[PDB]
């Protein structure tokens, strides 16, 4: 049972520090490099720094001077990053994993965190507004009927979407979310069986925890 | 510091055909390269370590070996869980690097996009605003071409992309397309229409409504 436990997600203000963490438990903690590494949305993996505990031994990529400061704690099994100055482009999941102080081919890069996600955002929390997507009175095709719902200007992510309360799931997109100025919009779509559409509502539920938001939005045909 | 140049980017195969990937190191690196596997959950994996080991409970069907300052990972048989991201790494000398990725998807049949176009709902309308929302749905392959017109005319301000990964059950993708404008500018005009370009036809997939149309 090598372990490393990494802090949660992090929100943060443009210019702020924030000190994440990564949680050792199954081996000697001084042994090994704590290696740190950035991930940015849709990018590769890039190496940003290590430190060795409990020594003054760190190290770090070039371009994170004045920006990462390493540290580590052997009492409770813990090494910290700390990032400062946040802008915009910190925005990203950051993963920790461990480095042998030896030699050994097989303990290098070895055990992986699962990441801890920082958000560098000015804005306020802010629920979404729900809108409904009806044709706007097409050929409907002739077999299936597209549907959809807008959620937009809410922050932070993430927001559900769900069709019919999830009874409806088979004919589902829900797409990413996109920043629209300081804030997300998503949309969702769901294809159904003409047959079934305006016959009867199809609705989609949108929940929004970060806002205490929830609600249904029933898509009604247009009609004009 | 030692650079990774890892090719190819991207690269589309079938269950149970073989493929490798390429790390071709700048400076010499040893046998000191690993390689990584991330699922789209965000997972990262080490595969192979020091070149040519296996991880323990690793499958067999992985493989890392160099020729030169090519380092590769051969899979020789695709299975459907395969299908995603590889990165290797060189930690012989400090600062490490990785190579900048290769993403592995899915051959499947040729599919032309489902488009549809929505207008704005009237609680926008009342809100100030006015988003018009075109789906394009289950296509294969991932290059698409978007193109918006109003009244006849090519408009690229305003418009937003968004992108679903390969599909885990039939392989395609599918895209929202979203043009945003005040309440006063989408009522300056009339007829609005997303166009979609991709391989399956040789001319594109036209959505259009009118606002004065109802």
């Known amino acids: 049972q090598v372990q490393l436990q990494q802090s949660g997600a992090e929100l943060m203000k443009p210019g702020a520090s924030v000190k994440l963490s990564c949680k050792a438990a199954?081996?000697?903690?001084?042994?090994?490099?704590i290696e740190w590494i950035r991930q940015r949305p849709g990018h590769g993996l890039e190496w940003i720094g290590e430190?060795?505990?409990?020594?003054?031994?760190?190290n770090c990529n070039e371009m994170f001077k004045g920006k990462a400061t390493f540290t580590a704690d052997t009492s409770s099994n813990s090494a910290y990053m700390q990032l400062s100055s946040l802008t915009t482009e910190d925005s990203a999941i950051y993963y920790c994993?461990?480095?042998?102080?030896?030699?050994?081919?097989?303990?290098?890069?070895?055990?992986w965190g699962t990441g801890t996600t920082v958000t560098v955002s000015s804005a306020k929390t802010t629920p979404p507004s729900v809108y409904p997507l009806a044709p706007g009175s097409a050929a409907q095709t002739n077999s299936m009927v597209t549907l959809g719902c807008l959620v937009k200007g809410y922050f932070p992510e993430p927001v559900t979407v769900t069709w019919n309360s999830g009874s409806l799931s088979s004919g589902v997109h829900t797409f990413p979310a996109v920043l629209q100025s300081d804030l997300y919009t998503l949309s969702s779509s769901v294809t159904v069986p003409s047959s079934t559409w305006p016959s009867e509502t199809v609705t989609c539920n949108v929940a929004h925890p970060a806002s205490s938001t929830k609600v249904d939005k029933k898509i009604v045909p247009r009609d004009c | 510091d030692i650079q990774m140049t890892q090719s190819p980017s991207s690269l589309s195969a079938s269950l149970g055909e073989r493929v490798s990937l390429t790390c071709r190191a700048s400076?010499?690196?040893?046998?000191?390269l690993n390689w990584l596997q991330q699922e789209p959950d965000g997972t990262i994996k080490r595969l192979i370590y020091?070149?040519?080991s296996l991880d323990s409970g690793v499958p067999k069907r992985f493989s890392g070996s160099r020729s030169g300052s090519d380092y590769s990972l051969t899979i020789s048989r695709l299975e459907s869980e395969d299908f995603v991201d590889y990165y290797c790494?060189?930690?012989?000398?400090?600062?490490?690097?990785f190579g900048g990725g290769t993403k592995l998807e899915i051959k499947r049949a040729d599919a032309a996009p489902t488009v549809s176009i929505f207008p704005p709902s009237s609680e926008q309308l009342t809100s100030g605003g006015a988003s018009v929302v075109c789906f394009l749905n289950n296509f294969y392959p991932k290059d698409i071409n978007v193109k918006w017109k109003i009244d006849g005319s090519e408009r690229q301000n305003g418009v937003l992309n968004s992108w679903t990964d390969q599909d885990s059950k039939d392989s395609t993708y599918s895209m929202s397309s979203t043009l945003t404008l005040t309440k006063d500018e989408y009522e300056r005009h009339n007829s609005y229409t997303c166009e979609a370009t991709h391989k399956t036809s040789t001319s594109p997939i036209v959505k259009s409504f009118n606002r004065n149309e109802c």
């Open positions: 994993t461990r480095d042998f102080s030896g030699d050994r081919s097989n303990l290098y890069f070895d055990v």
């Open positions: 199954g081996y000697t903690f001084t042994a090994y490099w």
């Open positions: 430190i060795l505990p409990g020594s003054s031994s760190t």
């Open positions: 400076q010499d690196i040893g046998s000191s």
């Open positions: 020091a070149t040519s």
């Open positions: 790494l060189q930690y012989a000398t400090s600062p490490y690097t």
